[PDB]
Amino acid sequence: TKYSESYCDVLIVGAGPAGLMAARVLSEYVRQKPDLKVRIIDKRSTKVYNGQADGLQCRTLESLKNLGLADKILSEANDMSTIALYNPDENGHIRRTDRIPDTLPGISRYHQVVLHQGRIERRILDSIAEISDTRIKVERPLIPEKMEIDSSKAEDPEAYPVTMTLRYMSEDESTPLQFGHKTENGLFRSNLQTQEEEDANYRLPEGKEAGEIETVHCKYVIGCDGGHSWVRRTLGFEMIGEQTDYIWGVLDAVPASNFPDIRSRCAIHSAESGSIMIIPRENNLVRFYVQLQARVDRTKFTPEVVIANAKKIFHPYTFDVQQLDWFTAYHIGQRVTEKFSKDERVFIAGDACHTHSPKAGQGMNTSMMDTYNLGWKLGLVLTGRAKRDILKTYEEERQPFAQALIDFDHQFSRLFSGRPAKDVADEMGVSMDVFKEAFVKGNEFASGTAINYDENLVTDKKSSKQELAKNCVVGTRFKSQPVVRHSEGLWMHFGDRLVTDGRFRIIVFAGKATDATQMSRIKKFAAYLDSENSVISRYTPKGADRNSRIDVITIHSCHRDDIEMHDFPAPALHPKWQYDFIYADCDSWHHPHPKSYQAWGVDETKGAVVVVRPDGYTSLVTDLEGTAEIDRYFSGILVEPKEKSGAQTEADWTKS
Amino acid sequence: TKYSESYCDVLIVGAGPAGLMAARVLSEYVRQKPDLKVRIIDKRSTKVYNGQADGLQCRTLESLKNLGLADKILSEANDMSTIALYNPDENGHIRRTDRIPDTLPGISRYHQVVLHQGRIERRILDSIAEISDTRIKVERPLIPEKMEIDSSKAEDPEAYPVTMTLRYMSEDESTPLQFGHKTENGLFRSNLQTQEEEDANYRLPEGKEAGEIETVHCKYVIGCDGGHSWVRRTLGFEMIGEQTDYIWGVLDAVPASNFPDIRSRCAIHSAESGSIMIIPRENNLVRFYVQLQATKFTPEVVIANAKKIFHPYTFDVQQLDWFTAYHIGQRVTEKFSKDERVFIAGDACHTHSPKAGQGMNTSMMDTYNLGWKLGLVLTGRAKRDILKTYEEERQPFAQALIDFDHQFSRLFSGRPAKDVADEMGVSMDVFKEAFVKGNEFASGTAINYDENLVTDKKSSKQELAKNCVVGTRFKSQPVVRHSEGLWMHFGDRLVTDGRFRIIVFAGKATDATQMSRIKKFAAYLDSENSVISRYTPKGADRNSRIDVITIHSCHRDDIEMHDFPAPALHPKWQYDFIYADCDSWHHPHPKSYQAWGVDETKGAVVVVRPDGYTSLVTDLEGTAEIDRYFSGILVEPKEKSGAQTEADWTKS
């Protein structure tokens, strides 16, 4: 056995969706500060497909767009579009009673889509490689065997309070079981697997000696290690929830069926044989979640068994498989922890914190959104740009969301798994009216766009004048609306401008800038920005671009024929030879006036100022005179650079 | 000297946009019939990396989408959006007098975008590699030294009437690019960056050596060798036109300027110093066409002229990526083909100014047209006579392009009139008009091919699809895919792969009388001698030669896919055939029947060529016209599919 010892800033344990998103987010900070050492490990080989998800929801897609990942995924993914609801009639034959939209109209410019998890990961990995310049690479197969946390060093910025002992595994150890089935399957990582079996399966066998045992001193550790999280259990964080006896199977197949809505998302409640959810996929595939009749013996859980019950559920429609790519099984159950962090030094995220059914395809989404939230906070802390206290907001924001997810799924999964009521007198059965209602309501939650974080160090409701941007509620995501880029008149979704890279934004709704009184207010605000002690002047390092830490963007309510970019303060709002700063809420060649001030709830004449966090959540709403509020908001979060930019000293480049 | 000898089906001379499009289009046919041998050569050691062509117009993008190339290009390209017009006031000071849209509203679902030729070459090269499974690779640097054509063998399908003598060039002989490939910074290389780097090295085909002379017997040759086309000259086709004394320079630069519309497309007529056209580009670049006032033109001189024209706004270059100079002129050939055996396309056929960025557009559209015709001939699927339609269709377009450019380039290059009586000057009102009208032509969407072997106006009942005029491109309209209710642009469904389409506008399919007509039409499709049964090879999918697609006018809540004839209109376990003109979750009813000019109740049948041009309009009863149309074009396979015998897959 080789014994080794090293140091690192962050160790990410697990390279599924949560871990990969953590690495992608952190990659930006490593690029800015190359001596940062971020490592990510995984215990499984890649020889057996190590995935199971396919759905990406609206907010996840908005976030992926801001990471440069959405368009590539969308090039392949399938938009299921419709959810068709089938349930039994008089004679117990299922038929379509209703259709509802798969994405609620107006909720986001992105619709939910589905795509093989491996393809989604490949896109994220490519982005990690690009942003990190190939320096962040998944290390496998490695597995922690010991974690020691020195709580007395939690607040020391120079300390490595977390000692992780890692074992370098052999290929055999890292290979998951397949249970004798010829078709590739996810039984090994289903919740049919116990946590004891999980541990035992990857252990160093009796007799053999480990290749290498590495002692890694870490500033921070993120447990992204799944439902049976070794990190969570080592932390001693209990999970609450119980598993039911409901059992479902999953088939990723190219179907041969005369079912009319085989290519639509569908919920089917059969009279007595269970339910099905149809998730139509890319490349002629369709995924079928098929409820089965009822520990279950995994070697006996075959595709044939799943297919048999599916045919029953589809009756009298036919159902056959032309090709079967993969399958799995799972029980219906919910679990969630109360704690997401020990000392704000070891964090857990994703399935490690919350498990539930796939009826609303929420897990990968939530898990990635957990580390999208944690990652910028840790990134700013590690680069000496933010106060460590911001890390407390990860649990404060993400844990209540996990509880809500579990509560939502607890009801939805049971309604989906129950026998449909025959009439109003069938008390034991599930009401199909109630089910539809739960589905429609659930679609708002499932979108991921309705989150409203409670007041905290990075979310300032108390100092806000919310009425000034009524539809930019502090604590919720800043919603994209169409705008016209002033420079050439390009109509575009403003959300595309909020590239996630560690910067906060100050969105200056400049209002009716052609009005002299209003322009006087805009000028005074710019004079504040240019002042020696403004947030721009004190949080931008000397020599750095003044939009590189806080990105100050102006959206006015005038038509571009009526005012020029150079009529705005330069360079405070109109930076030198740069053209991605001034946007207009106005009519354009190919689109009508988008009424985007109105959609944002901002007065067209007077405007407002809205601060947005690096993860795209609104954190403060004030007026152009509210510079003290802006100042205090940032004082509570950011750390002054050793040498600051200080007062804006450049002459107006539009004259010169 | 080493000599060699070989045979091939098509030799494409030149691997610019015209040639690459030809190879991309022919790639599909090679994939279907791998015995086919298609070669493409270039006398330059590497592809282009910067500058040159940068404009992609509406119809080109529609066509690129149908080749699977639009989205990748759009991920990088810039939509200039607005054209700002600047000219002098009474005191000779330039000011913005107007703005017009860079793409006319409603003309296409694609707007014009700009992105340099190197990126376009990269994308088409990658698609060739995928579709041909690398069976087609550009061979470079190679150059023709001799061409012999035996006209007595023009109509013999087994002959190789064109003998090409080629020479393999040394690295030293190939004239390199001034602005070539640049190594990326850092460790990371995307697949695209890696391919770019590999492509930047001099490398002859495997086993070949500089100096080797190869005699290549060819069935067909396509000269895509640019404005000074050796192929054209060898054929003796005179480049008819004239060259003015106007000289312009071009700078691809990241500008440092206080000009208010520096990121917009602009036309600027200065009082006395010439004109500029600004073409804002990707990645902070802006291209400047700068008219020069009067041996060796440099960027410095172009910048000096630009500073004078911009006055009093500032103009400096922070970074320069490319530059060139050119004279304003127009030339076009009368002929595009010798024996329908050697063809020319692109700049080889037509040269003109870049004021409307028409070069790459028109050139790729030339080989998009020729390529499917040649592909069907080479695969034994169509009669050789269809090749005559390439010249018939593309030559008159080239003349129209030259006529358009002759006026536009001169208006752009003239001194703006100082007053109404300043006859020696250009009216800015006239210029605006010409720009607006030009934008329709320049979009490439207004083409109307004259009746010919593949364009049947005489047999059509045009009033049944009033806005699907025979000879024009079949315009995309939004529809709702029936299977899941996906709102989508119908044009996305017309993937270019050699198939003709029959678009069945089924109308109000819930009406019993109308469904009876739909059923009768499907009975025709299924019949032993229908175009489907007669031109689909035995054993092949019945939508693999003629692709029969149904768009009805009902809501998907009111009728099912399985209510339509299956498998004639609703194929077995396939879901990209039935679409609806109806309301949907996220969009209102798109009124697409109305946009297409088809009666919502009675519908129509519209035949579309493999290049997406409408070729026949008739009713569901017009099966005889459909038969006659295809009979003039397609060749029956030796063993046909015959009558459809499979039972309706939807009934258990």
Ligand SMILES: Cc1cc2nc3c(=O)[nH]c(=O)nc-3n(C[C@H](O)[C@H](O)[C@H](O)COP(=O)(O)OP(=O)(O)OC[C@H]3O[C@@H](n4cnc5c(N)ncnc54)[C@H](O)[C@@H]3O)c2cc1C
């Ligand atoms: C059948 C099914 C379908 C689903 N469909 C969807 C869907 O469509 N959309 C959606 O959003 N969610 C879906 N989910 C949920 C989704 O799969 C999970 O919530 C998500 O994968 C959890 O991501 P994660 O990164 O937190 O954990 P995981 O995906 O479990 O990844 C954990 C990673 O850590 C590694 N690891 C584990 N232990 C260790 C260790 N001790 N040391 C080193 N590495 C370790 C694992 O090998 C694995 O690579 C579905 C779930 C199931 C059951």
Ligand SMILES: Cc1cc2nc3c(=O)[nH]c(=O)nc-3n(C[C@H](O)[C@H](O)[C@H](O)COP(=O)(O)OP(=O)(O)OC[C@H]3O[C@@H](n4cnc5c(N)ncnc54)[C@H](O)[C@@H]3O)c2cc1C
């Ligand atoms: C130097 C230059 C500058 C240009 N600048 C602009 C501009 O500013 N704006 C604009 O809109 N358009 C410009 N163009 C025109 C534009 O690039 C073309 O219209 C467009 O690329 C379509 O041309 P094509 O494919 O037919 O020919 P080309 O693009 O010229 O490509 C022809 C190819 O054939 C090869 N070739 C030539 N002779 C032989 C031979 N005898 N044997 C083998 N191969 C040969 C060449 O190496 C080249 O790769 C420019 C073109 C050139 C050459």
Ligand SMILES: [Cl-]
């Ligand atoms: Cl993206």
Ligand SMILES: [Cl-]
């Ligand atoms: Cl595309």
